[PDB]
Amino acid sequence: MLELRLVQGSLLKKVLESIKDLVNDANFDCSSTGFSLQAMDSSHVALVSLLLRSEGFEHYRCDRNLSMGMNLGNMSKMLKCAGNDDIITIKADDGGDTVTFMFESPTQDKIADFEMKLMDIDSEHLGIPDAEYHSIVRMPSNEFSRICKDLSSIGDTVVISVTKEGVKFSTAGDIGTANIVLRQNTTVDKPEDAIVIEMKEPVSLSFALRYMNSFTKATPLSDTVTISLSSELPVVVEYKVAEMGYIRYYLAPKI
């Protein structure tokens, strides 16, 4: 059987909000290691990799490795009904066609039971090697979100380039051109100034802002976002899920 009890239910709510607009249907893979997911958008242009480690759950029971195919929008609609302070439990019968989400208030004065139909999904999973990226940008998630929103109002493509002079986000459109250059502050003296730019080799790649903007739906999960770049690879945009996992977005470049 499957029974996963997550005390911080709001994390699951945020995770679903982060992926439902990128992928319509996807499989959630359960194993003794954790609750995960890997799926590409319909265009195979972007990929999302989610992992909630077993250690983050208060109760974790997964008798056998299993996969639950789900309509992400429907799962999100149900999770939207859980309170931000609710303890959420995912229950499933290995030989079942439905999944149950229990929503429990801390005092227990309220217990909700939401049940959803499971669907068969034959999704394509890709093998992703642990590479050492040439440039890595760790910056405030809110700032990354603003940059993508701002640039997308100007053009459709953003050129991200990292050199010893910092990281530049550039776009051009009908109304003109726009670029934003970020540099590490003298010190990390406040959250807004928490920008770390690691440059091993310079990198410059072009990406679709429409996708970048979808990735920013994970902003509420962390105050920080990490962008990893390499000349021969898709960009990786990562948001940590508390201290129990992550959501990693991969986006193929425009060349």
């Binding site: 394509e124 890709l126 679709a208």
Partner: peptide, 11 residues
């Protein structure tokens, strides 16, 4: 030209 994730990593 927009490349694909599959142009980098295979299934």
């Amino acid at each position: 030209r927009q490349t694909s994730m599959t142009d980098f990593y295979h299934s």
